[PDB]
Paper text:
Bromodomains (BRDs) are protein interaction modules that specifically recognize ε-N-lysine acetylation motifs, a key event in the reading process of epigenetic marks. The 61 BRDs in the human genome cluster into eight families based on structure/sequence similarity. The four helices form a deep cavity that is extended by the two loop regions (ZA and BC loops), creating a largely hydrophobic Kac binding pocket.
The second BET BRDs bound to tetra-acetyl H4 peptides with about 10-fold weaker affinities, suggesting that the first BRD in BET proteins recognizes the H4 tail. In contrast, the second BRDs of BET BRDs bound either weakly (BRD2), not at all ([name]), or promiscuously (BRD4) to histone sequences and their variants present in this array.
Numbering used by the authors: 307 to 416
Write the structure that this text describes.
């Protein structure tokens, strides 16, 4: 079983992965494939990649000991995006919209 807090976190993940947010969430569904995206320096710049599929695997694997660890990975995902891309990239705007969802939902955890 997941703790109470982590059951709430699981719901946030479900929401982030849901159709309602897909127009901006889709770049975060799978790990960045540096070769396929021709971003060949990606792993020189980003030392700790993260994406929502990995968060889902970790959740299912009961790897998070608390809600704070879940939040850390999700914030890492957005931060990687802000760090790597120019601030006017369309993907940064998509990250921001999805982060607005995440931060609001996380803060509203009972
Ligand atoms: Na609350």
């Amino acid at each position: 079983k997941l703790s109470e807090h982590l059951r709430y976190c699981d719901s946030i993940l479900r929401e982030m992965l849901s159709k309602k947010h897909a127009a901006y969430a889709w770049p975060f569904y799978k790990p960045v494939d540096a070769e396929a995206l021709e971003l060949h320096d990606y792993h020189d710049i980003i030392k700790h990649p993260m994406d929502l599929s990995t968060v889902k695997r970790k959740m299912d694997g009961r790897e998070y000991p608390d809600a704070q660890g879940f939040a850390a990975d999700v914030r890492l995902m957005f931060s990687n995006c802000y760090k790597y891309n120019p601030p006017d990239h369309e993907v940064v705007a998509m990250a921001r919209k999805l982060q607005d969802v995440f931060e609001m939902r996380f803060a509203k955890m009972p």
